[PDB]
Design a protein around this nucleic acid. Structure first.
Length: 96
DNA sequence: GCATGCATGCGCATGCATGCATGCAGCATGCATGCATGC
């Protein structure tokens, strides 16, 4: 996911080409909109690091970020940890 | 030449499947006892 984010933003020249795990190059540098298909799968990651960072930068006062998620499960609220749930703006749209 | 990240091998905990036994209740059977009945 980090590789795709870097490549789509065309910052690999700025960040670097090697496999180095440091991501503070983007994080320190970080209007861009995010679209997340199959949002439920991201909640099954080891620590939900990407979701937490996205919610943090959304709640931060550095740059404007809009987050849009798509889900088929009706229980997407309980699949999130307490911290991200608190930092998640409870904006839900239902398509029936 | 070195660092790094990935594939692999092994240990550990756990849940589940299997073996194993014992106590109870029902039933069938054989015996003890009561009854009839004649001589």
């Amino acid at each position: 996911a980090l590789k795709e984010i870097t490549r789509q933003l065309n910052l690999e020249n700025v960040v670097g080409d090697k496999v180095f795990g440091s991501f503070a190059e983007n994080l320190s540098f970080l209007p861009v909109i995010f679209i997340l298909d199959e949002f439920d799968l991201f909640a099954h990651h080891k620590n939900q690091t990407l979701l937490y960072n996205l919610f943090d930068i959304s709640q931060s006062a550095q740059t404007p970020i809009a987050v849009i998620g798509l889900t088929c499960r009706l229980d997407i609220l309980e699949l999130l940890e307490k911290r991200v749930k608190s930092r998640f703006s409870h904006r839900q749209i239902h398509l029936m």
